[PDB]
Amino acid sequence: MYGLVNKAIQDMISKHHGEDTWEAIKQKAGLEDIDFFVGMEAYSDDVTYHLWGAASEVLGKPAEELWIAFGEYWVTYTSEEGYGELLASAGDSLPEFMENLDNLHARVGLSFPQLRPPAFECQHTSSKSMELHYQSTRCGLAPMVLGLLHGLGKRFQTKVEVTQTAFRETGEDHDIFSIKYEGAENLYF
């Protein structure tokens, strides 16, 4: 993964648990040679997997729980580190935005020439619901989609219930999320 991701992890951890913890984590994972992470430079995935392995131990939090928090941060992080207009161009509501994910990652591809993006297909069972299909070149990142989907609720001021209905690990083609989403009707009635 690009340093861009590894820095978000760093900033997320430093923001939440302080710098000295982040330094412990960085030490335990085996990556003290790196004085810092470079956004537009590809690194081996291991760096990432390894950080979370260290983080998980040092913070006593399971991996699943870290990725989830990370999915939410990412959304915010990318919009603040200067990809906010990409985000804005991608959609004006939650359903619209899901359709344009492959496209957005293809536009991101021009700045990140070695990207290996996820693939999402959206199927709109109605205006309060969809299935989301998530295909990836990597293992185990479905918790991160949970985090993102929640971060997208907040983005569109929508309440989103997400439940994973297919798990790749049990022998499916890809992970599938069933997502319920309501606006303010939730609140008023």
Residues that bind ligand HEM (CB under 6 A): 1-2, 4-5, 75, 78, 83, 86-87, 101, 105, 108, 112, 115-116, 118, 136-138, 141, 144-145, 148
| Closer to ligand HEM by Cβ: residue 26 or 105 | 105
| Closer to ligand HEM by Cβ: residue 55 or 104 | 104
| Closer to ligand HEM by Cβ: residue 136 or 158 | 136
CA 143, 147, 152, 153 torsion: positive or negative?
Answer: positive
**Least spacing, CB of residue 162 vs ligand HEM, in Å:** 11
**Least spacing, CB of residue 87 vs ligand HEM, in Å:** 5
| Closer to ligand HEM by Cβ: residue 27 or 137 | 137
Residue 128, amino acid: K
- Burial of residue 50, with CB atoms counted within 10 A of its CB: 0-12 exposed, 13-18 middle, 19 or more buried: middle
**Least spacing, CB of residue 187 vs ligand HEM, in Å:** 25
| Closer to ligand HEM by Cβ: residue 47 or 58 | 47
**Least spacing, CB of residue 22 vs ligand HEM, in Å:** 20
**Least spacing, CB of residue 168 vs ligand HEM, in Å:** 11
